[PDB]
Design a binder for this molecule. Sequence first.
Ligand SMILES: CC1=C(C#C/C(C)=C/C=C/C(C)=C/C=C/C=C(C)/C=C/C=C(C)/C=C/[C@@]23O[C@]2(C)C[C@@H](O)CC3(C)C)C(C)(C)C[C@H](O)C1
Lengths: 69, 171, 171, 180
Amino acid sequence: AIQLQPVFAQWIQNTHYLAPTLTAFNLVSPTTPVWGGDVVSISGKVAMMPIKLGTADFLVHHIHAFTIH
Amino acid sequence: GHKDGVWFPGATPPAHLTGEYPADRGFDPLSLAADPTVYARMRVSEVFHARLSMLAIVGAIVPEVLGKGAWFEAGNSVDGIKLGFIAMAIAAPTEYWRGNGGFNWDKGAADRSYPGFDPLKLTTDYTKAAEIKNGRLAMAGLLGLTFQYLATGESPLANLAAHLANPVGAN
Amino acid sequence: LLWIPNATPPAHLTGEFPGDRGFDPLGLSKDPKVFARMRISEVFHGRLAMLGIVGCVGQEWLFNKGAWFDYSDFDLPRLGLIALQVIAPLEYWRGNGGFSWNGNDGPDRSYPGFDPLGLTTEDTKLREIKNGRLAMSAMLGLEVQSHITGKSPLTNLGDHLSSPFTANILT
Amino acid sequence: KYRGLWFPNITPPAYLTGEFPADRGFDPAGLAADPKVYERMRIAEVFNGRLAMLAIVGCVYPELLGNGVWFEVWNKVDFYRFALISLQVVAPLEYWRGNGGFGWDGEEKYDRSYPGFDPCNLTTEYTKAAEIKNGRLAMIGMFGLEVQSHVTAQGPVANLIEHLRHPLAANIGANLAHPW
Ligand SMILES: CC1=C(C#C/C(C)=C/C=C/C(C)=C/C=C/C=C(C)/C=C/C=C(C)/C=C/[C@@]23O[C@]2(C)C[C@@H](O)CC3(C)C)C(C)(C)C[C@H](O)C1
């Protein structure tokens, strides 16, 4: 519908996912799957997988900023 | 103080222009030369723009006369980037020396417009006023050559060859 | 403060200007005005060298672009033409002292006063000179190393760090 | 009347005293040495600035809304109709601005730079300087937009987003190193 995308956090996520190629060159893999990439799964169960942000993530985040203020 | 006249029939010269420097015809409607220190600079720039234009309008025609294409086809006949680099690399010392009036760090106090290269001793007021006069033509000419090429698209000498055989129906 | 134990300070250099350690064996700055220009040129060679050394190590180390002597990637006349067009008014205005035709106005042509934080003193001048001399030395090193070892300067540092007594100046 | 200067240790022109808002001693080409031209220049500077401020918001905001890019608008919109209708609308307004009023002799003598269209009484010799400085910033911006239009051939929000995503592969260096 009317989209409210969290574009700054998406930008930050992308940068953290690409970090091992320029800005943290001597690192092999990124710090966590959260930033992007493949699902880590031990046996069948998911250990970690990318967490994507959209309108729902935008509204909850601004609710958080409200209640802390 | 204008013996040689003014740019418009009955025009008044501006207050900063008092017929003292060569080829003054009392023309400054936008008052760009009101400040004298600026007008001193302006004078050198006009003469230089003039001397550069005269070598250029020659260089746009005299190659064409000897069958080498027009000035807009010179990009085919030379490596455009490369010559531009050597021109900028040779202009760098010589333009600096022109501006500095010499080779030493603390300026030279030579006349940087009229340096002294004259083995024939022709340096007179008439010739100073003829440098600028022939210059203002060549600038106007070069302004033509560009605008003629944008409106037409044939050679400069072809536009002349048109106009003698087409007085009415040139424009 | 002297460059070797008690080499008598040559009399052109007394010890007012920062960076004097009584060198000048060839007596190149025996005259005060040529000393003045040499001072400008020392600081300027310094500042460029410091940008250059940061340039060459930073491109190979921090930005993983490769060795600094590889130029096959880009077209050199194009960069030269661009660079010269950009650098020309900035290097004219620096030499000039400002923007006027007679221009020796405004700021100093070595220390023009671009300090927001207000940190300019004699001591910091000395620090600038000393870091500049080190960077000049480094830049000469980079060139000579490039032509003797034939490989990248970080690779040279790698070879000295791995085995210093085997990999050094007597390669 | 202390005021800052546009370049560290320079000396200001003698005709720029600080008497007017946003004077920073900047006239090297001597284009305001005569006082009557300096009067018109002053009106022109504020008016070019006001129009650049409108322009740069007009150029950026419909591209943000996905309504198109500012320099590609003329393949969906007819230019000549737009420009005819605009000059019809603008003409009596510009007339009155230059005139000083509605009368043939000026009559109702209004300030043609600072008329009173201010319901909040916010006008000071400070807000004047803020208006000038915001305007100068916008003029530099609209210069940027036009040159960027030619060099990169993408819109300005796209140009920003490209610089943010690939700061090394989308900057003036890389874009001018290539034929463009
Ligand atoms: C003082 C004195 C004497 C002396 C002396 C001495 C020791 C003088 C030594 C001079 C010395 C050693 C001067 C170095 C300068 C280096 C510079 C400016 C280099 C900049 C280099 C730059 C700006 C680099 C740019 C680039 O690298 C970048 C960033 C990436 C590359 O991809 C591309 C290039 C290469 C373009 C005498 C003669 C002994 C006796 C006398 O009596 C007194």
